[PDB]
């Protein structure tokens, strides 16, 4: 139960009772006042549609800052005054380094 | 000013054309190299188009 | 996640994950790509969701 949809990448912890009805809840559940949180039900005999899935979401971003997270690619020597394909922390391109 | 305005207008047109190279136009980035180096060809075709 | 060398290829071929869907990047191509930060959000979700 919530008043409006979440903005992207937003987290909510407040457990205030939703006042869906016109009657004020006054902080206590009852008529038209439901607990905002609900408990899952997971059993070893539950169906695949109800089986609990452990999920992870990975997000990447670059903020023109030092490239802290990189890959296992091995760096090579430095070449100057030659038309080469450079790759500086992902700055993929071609040109002459002088 | 009659001679200088022609040069100014041509320079403005060229500057606008150059600035137009840094627009997403709906893609994920304005740099073609980033699109080529991040996405596989089938997904990169849409951004390139 | 920051200031560490990553390896997404092993996560890709581990074959222990039911769903591996990436948006805006190619599973086999971010292996040689660099980012400033990586955020990992974890939770448990029902099968139909």
């Amino acid at each position: 139960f919530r008043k409006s949809n979440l903005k992207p990448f937003e987290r909510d912890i407040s457990t205030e009772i939703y006042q869906a009805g016109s009657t004020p809840c006054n902080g206590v559940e009852g008529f038209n006042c439901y607990f905002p949180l609900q408990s899952y039900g997971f059993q070893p005999t539950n169906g695949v549609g109800y089986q609990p899935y452990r999920v992870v979401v990975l997000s990447f971003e670059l903020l023109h800052a030092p490239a802290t997270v990189c890959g296992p690619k091995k760096s090579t020597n430095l070449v100057k005054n030659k038309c080469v394909n450079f790759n500086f922390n992902g700055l993929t391109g071609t040109g002459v380094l002088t | 000013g009659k001679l200088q305005d022609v040069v100014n207008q041509n320079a403005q047109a060229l500057n606008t054309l150059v600035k137009q190279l840094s627009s997403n136009f709906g893609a994920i980035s304005s740099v073609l190299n980033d699109i080529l180096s991040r996405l596989d060809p089938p997904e990169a075709e849409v951004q390139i188009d | 996640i920051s200031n560490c060398v990553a390896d997404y290829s092993v996560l890709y071929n581990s074959a222990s994950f039911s769903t591996f869907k990436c948006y805006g990047v190619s599973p086999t191509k971010l292996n040689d790509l660099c980012f400033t930060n990586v955020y990992a959000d974890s939770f448990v979700i029902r099968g139909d969701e």
């Binding site: 903005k7 992207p8 990448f9 937003e10 987290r11 909510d12 912890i13 997000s59 990447f60 971003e61 670059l62 903020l63 023109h64 | 997403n24 980035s29 980033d34 991040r38 | 805006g24 980012f35 930060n37 955020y39």
Partner: peptide, 18 residues
């Protein structure tokens, strides 16, 4: 919040705000 494209090159515009 929504952040400008100038400050983010590869990532999504939206950032954590909860």
């Amino acid at each position: 919040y929504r952040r400008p494209r100038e400050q983010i090159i590869i990532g999504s515009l939206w950032v954590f705000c909860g």
